Amino acid sequence: VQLVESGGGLVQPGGSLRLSCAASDFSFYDYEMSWVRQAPGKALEWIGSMYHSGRTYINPSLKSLVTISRDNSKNTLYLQMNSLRAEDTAMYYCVSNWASGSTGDYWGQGTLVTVS
Amino acid sequence: QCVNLTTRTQLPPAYTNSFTRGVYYPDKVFRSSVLHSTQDLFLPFFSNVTWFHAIHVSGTNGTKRFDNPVLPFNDGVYFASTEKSNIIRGWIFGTTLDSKTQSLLIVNNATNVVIKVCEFQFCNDPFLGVYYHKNNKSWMESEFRVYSSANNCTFEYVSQPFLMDLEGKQGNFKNLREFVFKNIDGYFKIYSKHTPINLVRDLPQGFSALEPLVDLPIGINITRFQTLLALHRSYLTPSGWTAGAAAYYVGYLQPRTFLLKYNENGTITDAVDCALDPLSETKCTLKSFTVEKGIYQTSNFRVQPTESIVRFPNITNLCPFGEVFNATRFASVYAWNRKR
Amino acid sequence: ISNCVADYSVLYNSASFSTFKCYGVSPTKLNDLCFTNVYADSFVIRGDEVRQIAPGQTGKIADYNYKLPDDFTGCVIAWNSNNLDSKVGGNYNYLYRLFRKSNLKPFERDISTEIYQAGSTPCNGVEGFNCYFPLQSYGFQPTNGVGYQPYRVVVLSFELLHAPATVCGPKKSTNLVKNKCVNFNFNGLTGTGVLTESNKKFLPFQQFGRDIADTTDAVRDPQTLEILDITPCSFGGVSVITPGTNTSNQVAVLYQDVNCTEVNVFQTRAGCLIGAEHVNNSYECDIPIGAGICASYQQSIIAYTMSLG
Amino acid sequence: FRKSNLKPFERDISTEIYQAGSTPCNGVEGFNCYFPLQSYGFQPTNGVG
Ligand SMILES: *[C@@H]1O[C@H](CO)[C@@H](O[C@@H]2O[C@H](CO)[C@@H](O[C@@H]3O[C@H](CO)[C@@H](O)[C@H](O)[C@H]3NC(C)=O)[C@H](O)[C@H]2NC(C)=O)[C@H](O)[C@H]1NC(C)=O
Ligand SMILES: *[C@@H]1O[C@H](CO)[C@@H](O[C@@H]2O[C@H](CO)[C@@H](O)[C@H](O)[C@H]2NC(C)=O)[C@H](O)[C@H]1NC(C)=O
Ligand SMILES: *[C@@H]1O[C@H](CO)[C@@H](O)[C@H](O)[C@H]1NC(C)=O
Ligand SMILES: *[C@@H]1O[C@H](CO)[C@@H](O)[C@H](O)[C@H]1NC(C)=O
Ligand SMILES: *[C@@H]1O[C@H](CO)[C@@H](O)[C@H](O)[C@H]1NC(C)=O
Ligand SMILES: *[C@@H]1O[C@H](CO)[C@@H](O)[C@H](O)[C@H]1NC(C)=O
């Protein structure tokens, strides 16, 4: 498959989870990677944006909370979330080229973020 | 898919005789029992039909060879093909036979026809990608091996497929599909018709009034084209490509003058040229198919020139426009520094 | 967009937009005005920059997103999306750019996110002194002014290339009447005549037909596929039968080959002659009319049949 | 804009508001009924044309 995602299930607040987003080749990595959320009723909120030029620009109140790591063997992205909240409880997607609309992107299988 | 096994067949075209072929309705106008003279592109009668015999099963044991060279498209071409099956997948009209330039494609895809002109990425061998998925036992119908990729599609056409098999009688028809593809004023017109044939290989002497099907306002000029051929992956049997054999004909169109006989239903019944022999050219002047005895004045004969000759003076003194156009100072308005 | 029918008329009255700025293209005549291609361009622009969607006004967006060209062929359209995109808390989704190597030329998808300097010191792969983030985000608040409200903008641009036109919408149609002189317009065929039902036998690829001397006789309407005959309705010259002004003043007028049912009245082979009574007698007449019928004044104009002898 | 074309050597003084869009204004200012008169901007360093 050209673009896929991995990792997820149940996320423990405070801890670190090594999420993944695999693919088939680096030539399909134009121009962006992003791990976003689409909450019911909430407007567009993007939690991550990995760029083709090796840049990660995030909301200033989020980039400190997010670790960034990019791979090229499996072309996977490593991102860690801590102190989780219920506002992220959605079908958590790994959307490559999120800003490129809903035709030049892949929507992953999805997971959930729940706080006990 | 991508089978280059010919190695022997680039034979000169075995020219044969086309008796009465290439007659078409060059309009969408009804006429009843009248004779009309038109100046369009037609196939001359009794002309050398350029026969590019298709895949040759020289019979000792198989030995099938691809016989589809890329052929030029000056102004218009006439096509004939027996095609007991749908051996020819379509056509490869284009200009550069490479990327960076659009190319018109017709794909058989024998459920519906998809006429596409797009940007393409010419492969090693352009043929409809037809392989098993290894599941569902379904042959592929992708253009991803017709061209390595497809992008920037400006036109797509969906309709009933062009090639209809109306035989239903185990042969004795042979369905000589006749095609002429004409590009005038940035358009593209598709003409075809299905007829029965009892002859073995030679074209029949009967009249085939062929009706137009669709017109394409692509706007893309074509100066070169190639034809497709059938391809299927082999099996685990005690490789196997191009099941069967075919025979494909090519004829080029030239600007000639015809007079078309119209029946009382508007269908063309006969057609006579105006440049083959004096008798046919005489019928054009009188606008009738029957001429009584006597003497007629038709046209005049002119001895065409053979070459050209130019005689100019031998001086090569290199006129001094450098000192005039690039003069150091252009003179005043009332003192014209005229330089003979 | 190519080879499609554009419903511009419904756009003007379906809803209300923010602005409709056209230069060289009248708004109401877009229904019959023709181009070659149509581009649908998707825009998200701040409310304060809504008036700044014009050649001459720039900013953080108009100087680095896509410079507006001087060859606009089309018009701009925007609408209020406050109920869909404006909320208390703000939105920080769509990207900014601060400075780059140069301003992005019109129609150049320079989507890349390379590192650029605002000053002159090198970045060395680390953003900092004179090397800042070339990406930021929107901010919109309903508690703010009108200029800080989100909008959805869609702008149309066209083409006039050297190719046949493909995108126009003919929302024009009229009913069909028969046996009357009508200035019909059947898919470009313009003329005058009476429409009558025909008994001809067409083929399903022939728009119309002409019998002899390039004169149209049958026309096929491209809506219900019927063959309609064409005939120019009655005409002809008018001639006056007079015995001379000095002799008298009563005159009779002729209508050449025109049935008076479509216009004393006497029916002749050369049209209905009106103004003269037809007598059953037969005299040696003086003024000829046609087909053996004549006229003479002897105290009114009376028509006869020629008496040879 | 105008309702129709102008006859040769014709005068226009009336400046009544007329429909310029798709909704009926009946004399109401704003959308779909444009104010006709507009003012140019002549700058010393403006374009050549
Ligand atoms: C679909 O859109 C365009 C046509 O509709 C195609 O663009 C053409 O192909 C090239 C890719 O943009 C362009 O060449 C690029 O532009 C300049 C000219 O040499 C160079 O700076 C670039 O290096 C060059 N790109 C490469 C790899 O060399 C053509 O100029 C351009 N031609 C026109 C008329 O637009 C696109 O190719 C096509 N989209 C895709 C993905 O192929
Ligand atoms: C086409 O022309 C021929 C005669 O020139 C006609 O074909 C047949 O003519 C008879 C005359 O009544 C009809 O009864 C038949 O129905 C026609 N054959 C068929 C298959 O219909 C006919 O007048 C013309 N039109 C057609 C065939 O559609
Ligand atoms: C066809 O080609 C051959 C030689 O190539 C020539 O001799 C022959 O006259 C041609 N036939 C016609 C009808 O022109
Ligand atoms: C040009 O013509 C010939 C060259 O063969 C020669 O006499 C000489 O170069 C020229 N003659 C003239 C200019 O008379
Ligand atoms: C005139 O001068 C320019 C630059 O010096 C040069 O490029 C050009 O070729 C000259 N024109 C002619 C007719 O010699
Ligand atoms: C054209 O449209 C009308 C109704 O929309 C329909 O009755 C008629 O059959 C249509 N004719 C064709 C040729 O589609």
Numbering used by the authors:
A (entry chain V): 2 to 117
B (entry chain A): 14 to 251, 256 to 357
C (entry chain C): 358 to 620, 641 to 675, 690 to 700
D (entry chain B): 456 to 504
Article, verbatim:
To further estimate the binding pose of n3113 on the SARS-CoV-2 trimeric spike, we determined the cryo-EM structure between a prefusion-stabilized ectodomain of the spike and n3113. Cryo-EM characterization revealed two states of the complex, the UUD (up-up-down) and UDD (up-down-down)-states. The global map of UUD and UDD were determined at a resolution of 3.55 Å and 3.7 Å, respectively, in which coordinates from the S trimer and crystal structure of RBD-n3113 were fit by rigid-body docking. Unexpectedly, n3113 binds exclusively to the up-state RBD in the dynamic spike albeit its paratope is theoretically accessible in both up and down states. Superimposition of the crystal structure of RBD-n3113 to the down-state SARS-CoV-2 RBD in spike revealed that n3113 would clash with the glycan of N165 in adjacent NTD, rationalizing its exclusive binding to up-state RBD. The binding epitope of n3113 is partially covered by N-glycans at residues N165, thus considered as a ‘silent face’.64 The hindrance for B cell receptor access caused by glycans at N165 may rule out the generation of antibodies binding at such epitope through natural immunity. Moreover, the sub-stoichiometric binding observed in the cryo-EM structure of n3113 and 47D11 may account for their lower binding potency.
